[PDB]
Scaffold this active site. Structure first.
Site, PDB file in Angstrom:
ATOM      1  N   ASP A  95      -6.929   5.481  -4.376  1.00  0.00           N
ATOM      2  CA  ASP A  95      -6.589   4.078  -4.386  1.00  0.00           C
ATOM      3  C   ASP A  95      -6.765   3.513  -5.781  1.00  0.00           C
ATOM      4  OD1 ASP A  95      -9.302   3.348  -4.507  1.00  0.00           O
ATOM      5  OD2 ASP A  95      -9.313   2.241  -2.594  1.00  0.00           O
ATOM      6  N   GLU A 152       0.812  -1.202   0.000  1.00  0.00           N
ATOM      7  CA  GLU A 152       0.000   0.000   0.000  1.00  0.00           C
ATOM      8  C   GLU A 152       0.846   1.253   0.000  1.00  0.00           C
ATOM      9  OE1 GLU A 152      -3.229  -0.211   0.074  1.00  0.00           O
ATOM     10  OE2 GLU A 152      -3.740  -2.315   0.722  1.00  0.00           O
TER      11      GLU A 152
END
EC number: 3.2.1.17
Length: 162
Positions: free
Chosen positions: A20, A11
């Site tokens: 995202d 991430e």
């Protein structure tokens, strides 16, 4: 290596609001803020999570805080899920991290949807699950991350992350 290090790699770490893979407002180490197209809705959610006026900026500590919380929620999600649980219980320490990764990434509901793959994992059919996991929408949409997770399940080593 461990789930914490594994997730940071996957991430990354950002201190300001970002989008995202789905285009949703996120922050830190993949902490989703909202699915709203409003960045102010994102900031709003953020202030209320951090407990101060952040203006969409947080400290490394604040990030690490949400992260730790998010990791615990993931496992909690696994432990409370009748489909997920038995697979968890059966995997080893490294392979469990791969499962937590998936839960972190798509949620408990998304994962329990992987009926055939979960079952192979459970039976320790490593190459069969890999092949299988490989033809899912998850793999076509996020191939880089899926490949590292798939290697982890296939091998039971941290190789893909090194």
């Amino acid at each position: 290596m461990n789930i914490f290090e594994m997730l940071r790699i996957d991430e990354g770490l950002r201190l300001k609001i970002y989008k995202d893979t789905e285009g949703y407002y996120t922050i830190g180490i993949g902490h989703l803020l909202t699915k709203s197209p409003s960045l102010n809705a994102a900031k709003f959610e953020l202030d209320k999570a951090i407990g101060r006026n952040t203006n969409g900026v947080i400290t490394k500590d604040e990030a690490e805080k949400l992260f730790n919380q998010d990791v615990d929620a993931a496992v909690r999600g696994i432990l409370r899920n009748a489909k997920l649980k038995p697979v968890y219980d059966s995997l080893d320490a490294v392979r469990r991290a791969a499962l937590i990764n998936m839960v972190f990434q798509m949620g408990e509901t998304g994962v329990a949807g992987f009926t055939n793959s979960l079952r192979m994992l459970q039976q320790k059919r490593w190459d069969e699950a890999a092949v299988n996991l490989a033809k899912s929408r998850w793999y076509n949409q996020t191939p880089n991350r899926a490949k590292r997770v798939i290697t982890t399940f296939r091998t039971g080593t941290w190789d893909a992350y090194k």
